[PDB]
Structures are given as structure tokens and as C-alpha cells.
Design an enzyme around this catalytic site. Structure first.
Site, PDB file in Angstrom:
ATOM      1  N   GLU A   1       0.832  -1.204   0.000  1.00 13.06           N
ATOM      2  CA  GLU A   1       0.000   0.000   0.000  1.00 13.06           C
ATOM      3  C   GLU A   1       0.868   1.255   0.000  1.00 13.06           C
ATOM      4  O   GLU A   1       0.582   2.215  -0.729  1.00 13.06           O
ATOM      5  CB  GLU A   1      -0.956   0.019   1.192  1.00 13.06           C
ATOM      6  CG  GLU A   1      -1.850  -1.253   1.318  1.00 13.06           C
ATOM      7  CD  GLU A   1      -2.523  -1.671  -0.001  1.00 13.06           C
ATOM      8  OE1 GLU A   1      -2.664  -0.854  -0.952  1.00 13.06           O
ATOM      9  OE2 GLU A   1      -2.959  -2.834  -0.066  1.00 13.06           O
TER      10      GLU A   1
ATOM     11  N   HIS B   1       2.079   1.887  -3.560  1.00 12.54           N
ATOM     12  CA  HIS B   1       1.154   2.709  -4.335  1.00 12.54           C
ATOM     13  C   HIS B   1       1.335   4.175  -3.959  1.00 12.54           C
ATOM     14  O   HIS B   1       1.401   5.059  -4.855  1.00 12.54           O
ATOM     15  CB  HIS B   1      -0.290   2.282  -4.009  1.00 12.54           C
ATOM     16  CG  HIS B   1      -0.703   1.006  -4.673  1.00 12.54           C
ATOM     17  ND1 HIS B   1      -0.590   0.804  -6.034  1.00 12.54           N
ATOM     18  CD2 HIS B   1      -1.309  -0.107  -4.171  1.00 12.54           C
ATOM     19  CE1 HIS B   1      -1.096  -0.388  -6.338  1.00 12.54           C
ATOM     20  NE2 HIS B   1      -1.534  -0.956  -5.225  1.00 12.54           N
TER      21      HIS B   1
ATOM     22  N   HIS C   1       0.539  -1.863 -10.037  1.00  9.43           N
ATOM     23  CA  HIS C   1       0.743  -3.319  -9.944  1.00  9.43           C
ATOM     24  C   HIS C   1       1.676  -3.856 -11.029  1.00  9.43           C
ATOM     25  O   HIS C   1       1.623  -3.425 -12.197  1.00  9.43           O
ATOM     26  CB  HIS C   1      -0.567  -4.070 -10.014  1.00  9.43           C
ATOM     27  CG  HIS C   1      -1.437  -3.869  -8.819  1.00  9.43           C
ATOM     28  ND1 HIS C   1      -2.805  -4.019  -8.868  1.00  9.43           N
ATOM     29  CD2 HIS C   1      -1.134  -3.522  -7.544  1.00  9.43           C
ATOM     30  CE1 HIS C   1      -3.313  -3.775  -7.663  1.00  9.43           C
ATOM     31  NE2 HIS C   1      -2.320  -3.491  -6.840  1.00  9.43           N
TER      32      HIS C   1
END
Ligand SMILES: CC(C)C[C@H](CC(=O)NO)C(=O)N[C@H](C(=O)N[C@@H](C)C(=O)NCCN)C(C)(C)C
Ligand SMILES: [Ca+2]
Ligand SMILES: [Zn+2]
EC number: 3.4.24.86
Length: 253
Positions: free
Chosen positions: A185, A188, A194
């Protein structure tokens, strides 16, 4: 790198679910868990060479831990990320994860404006195996507060947020698994998308070290690559980092 601007300081929030079920209803147990986790995630970040050379030393440190010992009482119709009931379905163990992230960002906005990142640690069983969610690195948001005027909320919220649950399929996940969720997380947040199957370098087979941390399917953690960023992640974040570092990163304590 700028040693005065190499660390993303975090506001870490433990909600009442996390306090009860991971913290055993104790502040010390709750804060120790989080301090140790963030330090292990920091080891991953700090050792990552974003260019494959001398561009390493960026990481994360906790500025504050907010510990919510009991549920947020709410009026009928009102919601809050720390309320007792799940939303939008009070009969489920967990919120809809996207709605929970939005709500957390709304409720924490004042605080989130003053820190590089805010991260919610919770203990609820998101549907269909989901472990966490973050803004940034989606095909915006991530490190350093970026305003979004919420037409529904009627105020600015900031997109420098993410969350991790340490419950999945009716049990507490392993610490080695929890570390991977929060690393993903925060990845990101730092700007990574991804890893795609179509780039073998970024998504190796099990006999070449297995998947890297930004793979969309939970890396179980016993393979060599599982706790590392792929070259895809590095290139993406490398565009992020220096810019953002000047914007909101601080000196490592
Ligand atoms: C740390 C992981 C990679 C986070 C991602 C969600 C994500 O991309 N967050 O930014 C996740 O929960 N993935 C789940 C996941 O891999 N869960 C595992 C534990 C699982 O359920 N495995 C069994 C198949 N149902 C999904 C949604 C793919 C089922
Ligand atoms: Ca779940
Ligand atoms: Zn993801």
C-alpha cells in the site's frame, strides 16, 4: 539524495478494532506492533536503489500514533471510519474497502494536511480476500497531501492515505504477511502500479524468486522476491521520489 529530506513521516492510526483484536486492549501492545512493523517496512524502502545505483536511503518513520480505544459514536445517518458498524452493510464484518479509505481520508483531513502520509491500521475481514488499499499508483494521490474537493463531503480531503487490515478469512494474518500488505500500500503511495504478468522481469516465476511486492495477488512471503520492489516499481517511484521529497519529506530521526 537530501539527508534533510529523505524520510516520509507518517501519521499512523489504530482504530478500535485494531486496538481490541491486535492490541489486546492495551496501548503498549498496540504501539509496539506498529512501531516494529513500520521499522521492518522502512528496512525494505531504505535499502531499495530507485535507479539501481546510489539512489537509496529513502524511507518512512512514524510521527504520531493515534490510538482509538473505543468506537466513534455517531448520530443516525452519520458515518465515521471508527464507528462501531460496518458501512454500507452493517451485517458484514467489514466496510466496503474503497468507501472506508474515502471515509478515513475525510475524517483525518486536518491531520493528513500536516504529514507526508496517513495510514489506517484496522482489523476487519474485507470481502473476497482484500487486505488493504491506497491512493497513488492507480491506472491520483500518494505521498505529500494533495487536495481533492469532495462534492459529497463539501470540503477538501487529502489523498495521502492508505490502509491495512491484519484480519483475513477469519484470522489474524502472519506478521510476515502484514509487512507485505503495508509495503504494497505504501508502494502505491510512493507511485508504483501493480506488476504485470506481461513483463517477466517484473513478475518472475516461482523458480526465479517469485513475485515482487507490487504483484496484485498477495505474495505469501516465503519467496526471494516477495519483499522487494520490481524494476517496474522502481522506475515508477523514481519519477515520484525526488520531487515529492523536496515537497514533504523530512530528516530521518
Ligand atoms: C497485499 C495485497 C497484494 C493487496 C491486494 C489489494 C491491493 O492491490 N491493494 O493495493 C489484495 O488484497 N489482494 C487480494 C489477495 O491477493 N488476497 C489473498 C490473501 C487471497 O485472497 N488469496 C486467495 C484467493 N482469494 C485479492 C484482492 C487479489 C484477492
Ligand atoms: Ca478478508
Ligand atoms: Zn495494490
Amino acid at each position: 539524495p537530501d539527508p534533510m529530506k529523505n524520510t516520509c513521516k507518517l501519521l499512523v492510526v489504530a482504530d478500535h478494532r485494531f486496538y481490541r483484536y491486535m492490541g489486546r486492549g492495551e496501548e503498549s501492545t498496540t504501539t509496539n506492533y506498529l512501531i516494529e512493523l513500520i521499522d521492518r517496512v522502512d528496512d525494505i524502502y531504505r535499502n531499495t536503489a530507485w535507479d539501481n545505483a546510489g539512489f537509496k536511503g529513502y524511507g518512512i518513520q512514524i510521527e504520531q500514533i493515534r490510538i482509538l480505544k473505543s468506537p466513534q459514536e455517531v448520530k443516525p445517518g452519520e458515518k465515521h471510519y471508527n464507528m462501531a458498524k460496518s458501512y454500507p452493510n452493517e451485517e458484514k464484518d467489514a466496510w466496503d474497502v474503497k468507501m472506508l479509505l474515502e471515509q478515513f481520508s475525510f475524517d483525518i483531513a486536518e491531520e493528513a494536511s500536516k504529514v507526508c502520509l496517513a495510514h489506517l491500521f484496522t482489523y476487519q475481514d474485507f470481502d473476497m480476500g482484500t487486505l488493504g488499499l491506497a491512493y497513488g499508483g492507480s491506472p491520483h494521490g500518494g505521498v505529500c497531501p494533495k487536495a481533492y474537493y469532495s462534492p459529497v463531503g463539501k470540503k477538501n480531503i487529502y489523498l495521502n492515505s492508505g490502509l491495512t487490515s491484519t484480519k483475513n478469512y477469519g484470522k489474524t494474518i502472519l506478521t510476515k504477511e502484514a509487512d507485505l500488505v503495508t509495503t504494497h500500500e505504501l508502494g502505491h503511495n510512493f507511485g508504483a502500479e501493480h506488476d504485470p504478468d506481461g513483463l517477466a522481469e517484473c513478475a518472475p516465476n516461482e523458480d526465479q524468486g517469485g513475485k515482487y511486492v507490487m504483484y496484485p495477488i498477495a505474495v505469501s512471503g516465503d519467496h526471494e522476491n516477495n519483499k522487494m520492489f520490481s524494476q517496474c516499481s522502481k522506475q515508477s517511484i523514481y519519477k515520484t521520489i525526488e520531487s515529492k521529497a523536496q515537497e514533504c519529506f523530512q530528516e530521518r530521526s
